Amino acid sequence: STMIGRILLTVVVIFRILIVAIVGETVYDDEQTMFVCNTLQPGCNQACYDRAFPISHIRYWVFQIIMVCTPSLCFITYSVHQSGISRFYIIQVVFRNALEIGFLVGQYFLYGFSVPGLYECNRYPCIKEVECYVSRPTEKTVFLVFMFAVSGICVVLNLAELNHLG
Amino acid sequence: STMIGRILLTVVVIFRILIVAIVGETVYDDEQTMFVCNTLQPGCNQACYDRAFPISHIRYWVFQIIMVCTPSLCFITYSVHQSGISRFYIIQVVFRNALEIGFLVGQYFLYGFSVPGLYECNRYPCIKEVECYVSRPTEKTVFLVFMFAVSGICVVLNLAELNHLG
Amino acid sequence: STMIGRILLTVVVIFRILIVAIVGETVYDDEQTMFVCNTLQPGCNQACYDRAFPISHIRYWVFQIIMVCTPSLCFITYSVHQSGISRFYIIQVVFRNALEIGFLVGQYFLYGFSVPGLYECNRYPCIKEVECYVSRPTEKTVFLVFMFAVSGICVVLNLAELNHLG
Amino acid sequence: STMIGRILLTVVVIFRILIVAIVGETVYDDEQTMFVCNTLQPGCNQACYDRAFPISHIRYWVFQIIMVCTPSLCFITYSVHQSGISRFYIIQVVFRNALEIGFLVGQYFLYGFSVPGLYECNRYPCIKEVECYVSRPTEKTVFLVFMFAVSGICVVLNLAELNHLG
Amino acid sequence: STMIGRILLTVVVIFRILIVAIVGETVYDDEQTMFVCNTLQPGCNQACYDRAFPISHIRYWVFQIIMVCTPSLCFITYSVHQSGISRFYIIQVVFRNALEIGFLVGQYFLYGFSVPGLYECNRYPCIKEVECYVSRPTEKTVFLVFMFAVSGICVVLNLAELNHLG
Amino acid sequence: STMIGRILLTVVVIFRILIVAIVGETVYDDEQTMFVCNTLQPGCNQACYDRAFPISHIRYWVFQIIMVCTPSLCFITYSVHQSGISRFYIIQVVFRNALEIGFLVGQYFLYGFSVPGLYECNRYPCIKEVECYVSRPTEKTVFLVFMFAVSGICVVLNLAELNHLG
Amino acid sequence: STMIGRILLTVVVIFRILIVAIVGETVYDDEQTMFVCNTLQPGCNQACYDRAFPISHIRYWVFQIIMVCTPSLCFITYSVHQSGISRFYIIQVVFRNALEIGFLVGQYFLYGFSVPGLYECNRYPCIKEVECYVSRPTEKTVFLVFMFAVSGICVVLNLAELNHLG
Amino acid sequence: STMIGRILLTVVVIFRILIVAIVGETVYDDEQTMFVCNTLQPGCNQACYDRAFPISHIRYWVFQIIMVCTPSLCFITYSVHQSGISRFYIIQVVFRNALEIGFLVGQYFLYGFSVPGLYECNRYPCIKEVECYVSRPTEKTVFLVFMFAVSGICVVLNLAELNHLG
Amino acid sequence: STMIGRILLTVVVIFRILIVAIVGETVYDDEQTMFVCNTLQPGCNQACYDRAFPISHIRYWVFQIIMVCTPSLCFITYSVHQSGISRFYIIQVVFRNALEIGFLVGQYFLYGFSVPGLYECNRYPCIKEVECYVSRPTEKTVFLVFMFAVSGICVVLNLAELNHLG
Amino acid sequence: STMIGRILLTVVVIFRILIVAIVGETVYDDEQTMFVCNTLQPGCNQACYDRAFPISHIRYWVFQIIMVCTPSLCFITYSVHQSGISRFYIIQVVFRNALEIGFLVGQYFLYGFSVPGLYECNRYPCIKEVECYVSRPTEKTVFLVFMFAVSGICVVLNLAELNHLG
Amino acid sequence: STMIGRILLTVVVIFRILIVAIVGETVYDDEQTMFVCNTLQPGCNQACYDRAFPISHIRYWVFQIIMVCTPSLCFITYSVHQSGISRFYIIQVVFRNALEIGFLVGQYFLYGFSVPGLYECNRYPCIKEVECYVSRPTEKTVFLVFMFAVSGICVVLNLAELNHLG
Amino acid sequence: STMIGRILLTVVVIFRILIVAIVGETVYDDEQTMFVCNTLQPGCNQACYDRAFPISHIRYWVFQIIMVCTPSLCFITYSVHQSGISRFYIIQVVFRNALEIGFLVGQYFLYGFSVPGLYECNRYPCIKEVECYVSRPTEKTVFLVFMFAVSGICVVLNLAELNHLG
How far is the C-alpha of I121 from the C-alpha of E63, rounded, in Å? Predict the structure, then answer.
């Protein structure tokens, strides 16, 4: 039971990297160029896009992926110099668990579970409240849900091993 | 008869990967930029494109290709650690069969066998029903039919071997 | 006489791959963006481009190149497993000959020997018949003629060897 | 305590390179194309963009990264020829410390800690003072703060080792 | 004297390949998008660009480079199978000489020694004669002259060796 | 003193190549698309851009970099065949010195030390004199000054070694 | 009672003529120029204006005014020639009564009692049903109601005198 | 019976003059400004308007009205000089009859009984056949029918008197 | 005191007629053509102009002027037929007083004492509330105040005479 | 025979005045606003309209009409002062004859007998020769022919009387 | 001396009326349509025109002309009823003097002696201060100066007569 | 000889009034709307039209006509009061002569003898010198020459009579 867990953790990590690297840069390419508002005022589209989408999903996901692979690099650099290893193993396991839970919680608090098609804006230089329209909302919602599911799997597996050793 | 089946399965898989990777990203590049509707209302083109094309074909095909190669990676990671293999072989064969049938069925239910040149839309902010026009419909239909045929071949071959061992 | 034929066949194949891979993606890049019709009707440019150019030349050529290299991959996979070879050699030679003749015949029936500068269109939503204008017609005609010549050479050489063994 | 410092310095350097190389070229891609001013005068957008953003962040960061890796290349070229090493080690450590402090100080004096959404311009050919509007200000502020933090960590670590040897 | 000639021929060939591959694709990128004519007639820009620039320089140069390297590939494939070589050497030298002289002569007859800034057009659908304007003419003339000079050097060197053996 | 000079020459050369290759292609990408003149005359923007910027900086720098590495390739090809070397060393040193001084002098005579924001034009089809406006002038001036400084360093170092041997 | 009726009839007639002649030509001046529909189809505004407003109010009112003054002109021309008058008086009274009742009934059946601000159209070349927008609807409704009231007064008065003589 | 005929002829003539003079100049005011065709070709609207409407209705009606009042002016000028009258009366009656029949016949042959909403055009510079759209067709048809009816009445009355005297 | 009152009443009436007739038609000529709102929605300008200005000032003033002159016309028609006059004088005086007070009260309730430069609109098809801008507001306010003053003078004078006779 | 000639001359003169005064100002109203040329050059429409139509027909006709009525005014002013008349009669007859022949000859030499629909122009600032398009050509030709006919009648009649007295 | 003064006063009054009535309505016709500001903000042209030109010159002049003719109408109405005249003459002279001095003083305080070509504006919705441009400034200044001169003459003459009687 | 001079003076005056009143208002109607300059700068068309045409011809001619009829009005008002006349006759003759010579001299100094088709402008806000284009130049030159000729005739005639009396 603890034997297969490692194998699947390695497989889940690689699957996630491949999905982000190959297709996600091209779902988000037209995000601001196809964002449009009903107005004749210069500068309102810029302000409303910035308030609706402060950090794009794809940037957050690349950052998370890189930061959850840092403990391994540290351990690798140490072992290369070596040429108390078990204590290092323990500590890096602890750190990886913490980092992945933090990133999942932050995703829920920043973005939620859906991307709507309409947005209501009241930022200067817009006069009163205006209505704006988003590009490709259904595809972006599907990507969000898939990523939450994969990261949950990873959290479960790492807790499994943490509680297995104790 | 069971000897050549493996050889051709390997060849079919590689052929499919090459076709998707080299040309498909560039048939679909202008999908929304050349989609147009007869209207003066801001935001109708966005809503109508999202309702006509919820998930693009090329995204679905990349995802399917990656997911049908996961059992092999698991088996490979196990065997590398090894340095009951036959039971693992049996189980992974079962899983691959199931995954490919699911993906083919889903394709039929999501997209059908053709891409029409006209689309009729009734989503807010469009006033009543409007008519919209698609880019490159004949080429997209040809790609759809070819992909269904290749995946059918793969399903047949894997069932062949499953029933051969029994 | 049969000695040099193999050497030149290998050279012809590589030459064709290089020409298609390095320059052809950029002759065809502006095909629809620089296609224009004399009209004020929304959707006519889309319909007329699709009827004039159903499958682009570059897509057809990539597909042909990949499909004529499949018998070699099958033979290679077999020989790797081996670690009646001559019968396999015979059969794959037969198949390659057939495939290349089919592709050349199809090219002649789909495209002909020239690309004209004007096109006459009568598809809905266009009112009666309209006149449209093509991008880079002379360069596209030159590419067509060159490709027919190379494929003819390959057909001749493979028949040479087929009749040599008998 | 001095053992782990080297390991983490190597890890920090690699992390910074990866973040700059993979995502930063695409946050800044639309910087001038989505910069807009309220005016009908030809040439004002150009003058105001140049005065607001003299050197782009991404250019400065690439330059800094390359220049802080020069002492290592010199030491490497010397040691390759060798096939007083400790004196060379001392001097290159001194130089790296100096270079990183200079670059951090310059960042603070050139850019500060935020990117505002509005800009006020009074350069010819603009008539009196005009108001202009920036693209993606919140994301650019986040990137600035992250980079200052990483470079601070590196400064601390290198001073640690400098004072350790003495 | 015959010793250094081979060394410099190899160097000239590599220099030419590098210049064409690294920069030439980006001098010619805006050739049709920045070509403009004084007219209100739909389709005249297309017809006039095609008549002024039938085959672009960069396409001709890539083709020439690939075709002058074919005799070497044939000789290489033969020698690999070998594992009358001197006769093959003689014949391939003859062929290379002929091919390079043909390509230089064709360049002179197709393009000349300059690219003008204005062009005068009388092709349907243009009414009578119209005036059109070219992008980046001085840079294109400089590239033309440089390429003629390099190819001349290569012709001289290969004739040198041909007459040396006799 | 002559020992370190070689090490630093190698380091300077590599630094220059990296700066040109990684960032310079993207400072100059919008050079003509963001060049604008105050006029209603077709063709004036084209003529004025060509007269203001005959050869772009980035093209000149790529060419210089490639040409200053040619003596090394010749020497390398000779030594490979070898498997009076010192005479070849002497001559190639002489040639490299000459080439780098020529390129620096030409830079000063072609471009100077600054790029202005305004340009005054009197070329046909422009009526009398018109005023035009440049993109990103401050960044381009900074790049110019940096490149002059690096090439000066290289000139000094090579003269050092030339006078050292004598 | 019959004495004042004639005086007021003369006054009502003159009041109506003055109102139509002085102001009504300028309420209706922008009727088609400010009529607008949500569409990109050429010719839909024309078809929809013609179907919504077949005969303009002001034309109908001018025609009615002229036709109800014809019996008087006939009687006047007769009496001028005279230089059974009572029989002519009787007959012309009968005719005037009939004409004014017909015109009032026709007004009710053609136009009703209000002019709405929105109009729904389904005439060729419009695709399906479209929405259009009217100019100055409230003012036009007020004018309609006033005119119905005045004509009713006139009908009552003329019947009064008809029944008075008997 | 012949007594009233003169009275009504005078009344019919005056009624016709009033209708043409007061309202008809403003039904036809936007005839060419609101005529539109589906095309991008300069000059097609002009050619198609001229072919659809060679002489406007209002011009023809003004001309007819003036020419049918010429015999009276001649008779008046004669009688003023007088200060065989019956012979002049006879001849002028004959001439008036002839003129009014000619004008009615010409109206039928030039215009017919309706004005359609669509027009089909094939005149240079239009490419093949194009579709054009007319302004206010229903109102123009109503005016046509009314004018034919009035002129018929006048013809009948004048023949009445001609046959009465004999 | 009662002698001059009649003289001034006649003078006030004539002054008012002249001011309305000569200049007011040209202050109001561009009322809707220069009314503008900040929106991209078709039909909002029409709806907002109709809600802000239901009946134009100039129409109301022409109507009032005509209706306050009706009692005089009735009295005149009676006296012409005459060829109890004092009772008719009494009654018409009463009616004129009433009519002028009603019109002044209505002006105050319909329009007030000022015309603002901004207007806030929330009528369909406008999305939420929009801001619109008026033409020539200061001149229109001046005209309003002047007209209220003149009508007040007339009211005072007519009451004077009414109370004088008693 | 000489009796009726005077009567008809008076009638012809009045007919001509009425036709010019009532309708001709409105055939020519859009002469320059609907004149269009195929070009993008500023100022070409102005130059080409001025060269095609130097003096408009309607101006020439008004001038002619006024100048042919001058002898009568002189005679009238003389006779009014009188309160050798026959000599004045003779001289004024001579002058009127001469003036009308001159004006008819000038019409033929200035305008001819038709107005074409196309015009070919080669005036600065137009580049080479351009094609332009005229408004309402058929109606203008009809007006020309009618006016020539009327003036011919007048010439004949005045010569009649001149030769009658002798 | 007092005899001619009356004659010239009558002549001056008539001259002024003719100049205002015949030409001034057409100098001012394009006042707002040719007023333009350098801005992209909706509503700024309206606000700036209203602040620069609160009451147009031509309106003020018509009003003044009508108000200075009121004393004469009162005197005329009195004298007509008459069918102490000298006292009425005295009083009306006093009133006319006062009215004309008031109007001249007001002109100086409202408009001054010139109309400039540029105007500087800072009214909402304009962002900060903007520059605007006026139509026909020189002609408007000439009209202003002429009108001041004429009114001064009238003031002088009326004071002359006032002091003459005493 | 002095008898006819008066008759012709009266005729010349009336002819001039008729020509100015009937046609000149419509040659000049599009003077600024069809004036165009080659520029993208806001406000340059306004400044250049004002500098090229400070006072329009038609305004100057109306003013001159009114001012040369003032002496007659004075004489008429005097003679009406009369109900030394010869002295008044003498003085008014003197004044008329002077006024007409002044107006002719001023015309020559203000306008000359031609109106050119091109105009060269250097007024702010135009950048350096720009080229502008005039409407209807040939017709305006013809009108100028005709008016100079008529006024010369009048000058000659009035001097004739002045010298006749002496």
Answer: 67
Asked if G136 and I53 count as a contact pair (C-beta separation under 8 A), the reply is no
Chains in contact with E, counting 3 or more C-beta pairs less than 8 Å apart as contact: C, F, H, J
CA distance A154 to F158: 58
Give the amino acid at A47.
A
Tokens found for residue J82: 């009188």
With b meaning 16 or more CB within 10 Å and e meaning fewer, what string describes G96-114? bbebbeebbeebeeebeee
- Give, for J133, the enclosing helix (H) or strand (E): strand J130-133
In angstroms, the separation between the Cα of residue G45 and the nearest Cα of chain H is 10
Q: What is the CA radius of gyration of chain K?
A: 21
CA–CA dist A143, A162 (Å, integer): 29
Which of L15, L133, L138 lies at the smallest CB-CB distance from J54?
A: L138
d(CA C151, CA C100): 8
Angstrom distance (rounded) from CA D135 to CA B117: 37
Q: Two tokens at E153?
A: 């050097």
* Residue G136 DSSP one-character state: S
Q: Is the CB of residue B46 less than 8 Å from the CB of residue B124?
A: no
Q: Give Cα separations from J132 to A2, E43, J116, J141, L76 (angstroms).
A: 87, 19, 11, 18, 57
Q: How far is E41 from chain H (nearest CA, A)?
A: 7
For residue F116, give both structure tokens.
């202005």
Judge: B39–G38 Cβ closer than 8 Å, yes or no. Answer: yes
Residue D138 to residue D141: CA distance in whole angstroms: 5
| 3-class state of residue H36 by DSSP | strand
> For the residues of E13-56, what is the DSSP string, one character each?
HHHHHHHHHHTHHHHSTTTTTT-EES---TTHHHHHHHHH-SS-
Contact by Cβ (8 Å): B133, B30: no
Residue E40 contacts H where some CB pair is shorter than 8 Å: yes
Residue A118: phi and psi, rounded to 5, are -115, 150
I74 → closest Cβ in G8, G27, G136: G8
| Placement of tokens 């239909």 in the chain | B141
Cα distance between residue C9 and residue E142, in whole Å: 39
Question: Cα dist. H19→D133, H143, K46 in Å?
Answer: 61, 10, 42
Give the other-Cβ count within 10 Å of E120's Cβ: 12
* CA-to-CA dists, residue H162 to A4, C54, H71, K38, angstroms: 120, 77, 15, 75
Contact B11 C66 (CB under 8 A): no
What resolution in angstroms, rounded to 1 decimal? 2.2
Q: Of B36, D12, J45, H131, give the one whose Cα is nearest residue G46.
A: H131
Are residues E30 and E135 in contact, defined by beta-carbon separation less than 8 angstroms?
Answer: yes
Which DSSP symbol is given to B107?
Answer: H
Q: Which chains touch K (3 or more CB pairs under 8 A)?
A: A, D, I, L
Q: Which of K77, K83, K91 is nearest to I7 (CA)?
A: K77
Closest CA to E24 of E33, E16, E32, E14: E16
What is the maximal distance between C-alpha atoms in chain B?
A: 68
